[PDB]
mmCIF file of C-alpha atoms in Angstrom:
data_model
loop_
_atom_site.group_PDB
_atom_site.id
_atom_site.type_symbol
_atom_site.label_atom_id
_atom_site.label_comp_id
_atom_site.label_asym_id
_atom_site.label_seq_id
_atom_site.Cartn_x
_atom_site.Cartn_y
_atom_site.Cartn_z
ATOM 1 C CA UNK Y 1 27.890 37.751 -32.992
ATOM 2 C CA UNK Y 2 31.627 37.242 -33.867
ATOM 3 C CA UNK Y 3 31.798 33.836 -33.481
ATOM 4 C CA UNK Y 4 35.406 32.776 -33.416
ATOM 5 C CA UNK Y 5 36.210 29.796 -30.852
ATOM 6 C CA UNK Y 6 33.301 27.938 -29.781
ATOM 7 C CA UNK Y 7 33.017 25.218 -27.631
ATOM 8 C CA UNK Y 8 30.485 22.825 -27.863
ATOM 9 C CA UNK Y 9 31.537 19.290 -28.232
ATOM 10 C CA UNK Y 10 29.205 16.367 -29.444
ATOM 11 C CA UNK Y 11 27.995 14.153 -26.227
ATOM 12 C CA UNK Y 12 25.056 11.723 -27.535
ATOM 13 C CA UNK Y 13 24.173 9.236 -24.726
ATOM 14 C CA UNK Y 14 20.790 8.205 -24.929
ATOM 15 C CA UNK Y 15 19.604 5.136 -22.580
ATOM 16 C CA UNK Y 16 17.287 2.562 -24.019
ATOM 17 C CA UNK Y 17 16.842 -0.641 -22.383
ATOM 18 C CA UNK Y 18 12.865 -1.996 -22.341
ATOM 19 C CA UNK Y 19 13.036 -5.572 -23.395
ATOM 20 C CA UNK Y 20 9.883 -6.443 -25.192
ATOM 21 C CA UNK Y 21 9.443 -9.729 -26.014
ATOM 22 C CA UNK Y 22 6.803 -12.291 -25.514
ATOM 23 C CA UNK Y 23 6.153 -14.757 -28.528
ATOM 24 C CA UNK Y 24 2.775 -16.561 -27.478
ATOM 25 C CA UNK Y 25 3.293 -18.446 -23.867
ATOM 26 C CA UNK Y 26 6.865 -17.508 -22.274
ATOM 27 C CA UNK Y 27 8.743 -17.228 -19.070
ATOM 28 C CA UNK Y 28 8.344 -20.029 -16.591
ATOM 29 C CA UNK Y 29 9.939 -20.881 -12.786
ATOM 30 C CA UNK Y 30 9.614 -23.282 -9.799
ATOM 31 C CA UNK Y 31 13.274 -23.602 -8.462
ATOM 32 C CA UNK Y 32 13.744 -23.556 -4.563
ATOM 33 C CA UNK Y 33 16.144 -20.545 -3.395
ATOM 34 C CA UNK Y 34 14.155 -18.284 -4.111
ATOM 35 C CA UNK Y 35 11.804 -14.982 -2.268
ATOM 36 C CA UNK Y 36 8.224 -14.123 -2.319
ATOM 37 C CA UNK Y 37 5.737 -12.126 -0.244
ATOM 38 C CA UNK Y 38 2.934 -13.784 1.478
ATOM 39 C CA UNK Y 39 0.694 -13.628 3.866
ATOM 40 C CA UNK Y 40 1.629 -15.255 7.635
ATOM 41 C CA UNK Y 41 -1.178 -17.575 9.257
ATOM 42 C CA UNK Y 42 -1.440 -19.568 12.933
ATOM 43 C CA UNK Y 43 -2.146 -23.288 13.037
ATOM 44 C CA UNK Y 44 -0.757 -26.291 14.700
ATOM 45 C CA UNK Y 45 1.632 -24.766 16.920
ATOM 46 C CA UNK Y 46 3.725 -23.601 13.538
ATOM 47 C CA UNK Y 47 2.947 -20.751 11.001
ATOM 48 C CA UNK Y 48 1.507 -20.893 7.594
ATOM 49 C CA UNK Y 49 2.409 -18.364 4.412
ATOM 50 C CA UNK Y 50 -0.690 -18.277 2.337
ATOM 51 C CA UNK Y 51 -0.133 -16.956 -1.077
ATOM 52 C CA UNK Y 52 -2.993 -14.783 -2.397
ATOM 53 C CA UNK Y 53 -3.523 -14.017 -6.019
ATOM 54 C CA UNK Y 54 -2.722 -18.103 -6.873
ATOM 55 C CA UNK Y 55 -6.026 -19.513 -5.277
ATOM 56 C CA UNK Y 56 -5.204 -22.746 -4.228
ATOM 57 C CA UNK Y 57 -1.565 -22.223 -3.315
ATOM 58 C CA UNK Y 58 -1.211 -22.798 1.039
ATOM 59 C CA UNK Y 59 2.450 -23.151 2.044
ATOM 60 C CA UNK Y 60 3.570 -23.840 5.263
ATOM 61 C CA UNK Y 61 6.172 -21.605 7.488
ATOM 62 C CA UNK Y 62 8.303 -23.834 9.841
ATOM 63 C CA UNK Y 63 11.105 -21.662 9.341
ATOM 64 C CA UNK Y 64 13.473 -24.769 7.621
ATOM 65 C CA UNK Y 65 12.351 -26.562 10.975
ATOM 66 C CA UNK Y 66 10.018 -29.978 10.074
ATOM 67 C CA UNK Y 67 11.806 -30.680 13.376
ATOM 68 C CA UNK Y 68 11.054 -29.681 17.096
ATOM 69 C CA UNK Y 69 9.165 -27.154 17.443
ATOM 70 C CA UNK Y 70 10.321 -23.856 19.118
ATOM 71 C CA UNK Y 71 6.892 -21.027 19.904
ATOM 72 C CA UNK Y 72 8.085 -18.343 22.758
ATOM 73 C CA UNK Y 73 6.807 -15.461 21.482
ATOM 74 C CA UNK Y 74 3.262 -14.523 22.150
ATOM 75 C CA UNK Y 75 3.955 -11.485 20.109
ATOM 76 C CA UNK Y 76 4.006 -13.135 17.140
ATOM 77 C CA UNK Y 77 0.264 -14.191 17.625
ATOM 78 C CA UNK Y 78 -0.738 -10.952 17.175
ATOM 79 C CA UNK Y 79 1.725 -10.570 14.370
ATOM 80 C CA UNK Y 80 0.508 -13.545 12.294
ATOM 81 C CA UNK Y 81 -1.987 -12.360 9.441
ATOM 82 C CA UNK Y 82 0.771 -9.558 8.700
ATOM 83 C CA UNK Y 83 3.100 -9.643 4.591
ATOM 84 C CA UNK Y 84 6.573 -10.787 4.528
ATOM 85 C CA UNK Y 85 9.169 -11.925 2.782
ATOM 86 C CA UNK Y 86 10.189 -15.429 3.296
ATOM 87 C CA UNK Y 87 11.683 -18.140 1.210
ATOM 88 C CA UNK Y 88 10.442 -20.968 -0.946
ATOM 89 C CA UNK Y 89 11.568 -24.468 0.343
ATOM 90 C CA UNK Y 90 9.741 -26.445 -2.479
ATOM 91 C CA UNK Y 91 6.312 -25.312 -4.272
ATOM 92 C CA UNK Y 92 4.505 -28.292 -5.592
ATOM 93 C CA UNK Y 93 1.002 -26.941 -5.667
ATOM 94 C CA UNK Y 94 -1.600 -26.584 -3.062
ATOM 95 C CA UNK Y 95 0.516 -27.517 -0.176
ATOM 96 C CA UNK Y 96 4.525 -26.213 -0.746
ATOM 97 C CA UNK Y 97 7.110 -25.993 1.977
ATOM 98 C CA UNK Y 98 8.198 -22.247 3.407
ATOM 99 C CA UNK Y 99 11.550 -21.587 5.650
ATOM 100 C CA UNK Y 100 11.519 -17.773 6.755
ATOM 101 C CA UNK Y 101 15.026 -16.632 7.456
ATOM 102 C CA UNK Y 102 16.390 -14.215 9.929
#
């Protein structure tokens, strides 16, 4: 094995990015703006996004509406129950305002 010219340059690039770090009680969050999964409900002509896993957390879907109503879509009867994404209007605990987009 003459070995005269070898090529075989040095290339270390490793990736390491976990982010461990949790010193007794941490992390925390209740600003509006923001997107969650829940479950869709029927009731009072509107729709309601009930948030399972909480216990005690019903929000309410009106779409940003708490305005005129607007229900033309028998559809979505059979629809309601069904997981989406919406967003959060304001979550004050037990009863929080929901405003599904598109």
């Amino acid at each position: 094995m003459t070995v005269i010219k070898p090529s075989s340059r040095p290339r270390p690039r490793k990736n390491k990015n976990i982010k461990v770090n949790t010193y007794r009680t941490s992390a925390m969050d209740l600003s509006p703006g923001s997107v969650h999964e829940g479950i869709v409900y029927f009731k009072d002509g509107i729709f309601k996004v009930r948030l399972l896993g909480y216990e005690g957390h019903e929000c309410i879907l009106l779409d940003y509406l708490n305005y005129r109503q607007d229900t033309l879509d028998r559809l979505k009867e059979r629809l309601v129950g069904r997981v989406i994404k919406t967003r959060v209007v304001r979550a004050d605990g037990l009863y929080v305002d929901l405003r599904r987009f598109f």
